[PDB]
Amino acid sequence: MGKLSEQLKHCNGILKELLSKKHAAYAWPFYKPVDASALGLHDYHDIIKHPMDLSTVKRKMENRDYRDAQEFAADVRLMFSNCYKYNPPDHDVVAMARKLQDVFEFRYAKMPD
Numbered sequence: 001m002g003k004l005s006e007q008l009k010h011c012n013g014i015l016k017e018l019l020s021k022k023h024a025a026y027a028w029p030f031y032k033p034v035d036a037s038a039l040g041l042h043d044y045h046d047i048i049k050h051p052m053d054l055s056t057v058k059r060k061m062e063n064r065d066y067r068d069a070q071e072f073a074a075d076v077r078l079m080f081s082n083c084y085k086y087n088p089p090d091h092d093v094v095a096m097a098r099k100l101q102d103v104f105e106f107r108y109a110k111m112p113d
């Protein structure tokens with residue numbers, strides 16, 4: 001219930017942007033947990049030990065799980081890293097990850113301090 005810190009307000013803003021229609025053309029693979037069984041990716045959980053996605057990040061922010069911006073950023077980067085680990089580098093989903101990570105990194109760099 002307590003107010004997010006100033007840095008976590010900035011993080012929440014970024015999160016809102018990543019989930020916004022503005023970026024939907026490349027963000028949509030990251031909206032929800034990878035459903036490995038549904039997608040036929042029966043090796044996914046053998047390869048990715050720590051799944052992460054934007055819905056999970058949103059829930060953690062709402063629940064005040066993140067104690068600082070660094071913790072938030074680690075989860076967003078984990079999400080991208082998982083994509084880069086599992087998928088061949090020339091896959092369309094990787095191109096989408098790179099584009100969304102560019103959005104993330106450039107706005108994260110504008111953190112107040």
Ligand SMILES: Cc1cc(-c2nc3ccccc3n2CC2CCOCC2)cn(C)c1=O
Nearest residue numbers: 029030034035039041082083086087092093
């Ligand atoms: C391996 C993998 C799959 C998906 C994924 N989530 C989907 C949801 C609904 C429908 C399809 C979904 N996919 C696979 C798509 C295959 C084509 O490129 C976009 C993702 C997302 N990410 C980040 C991955 O690393």
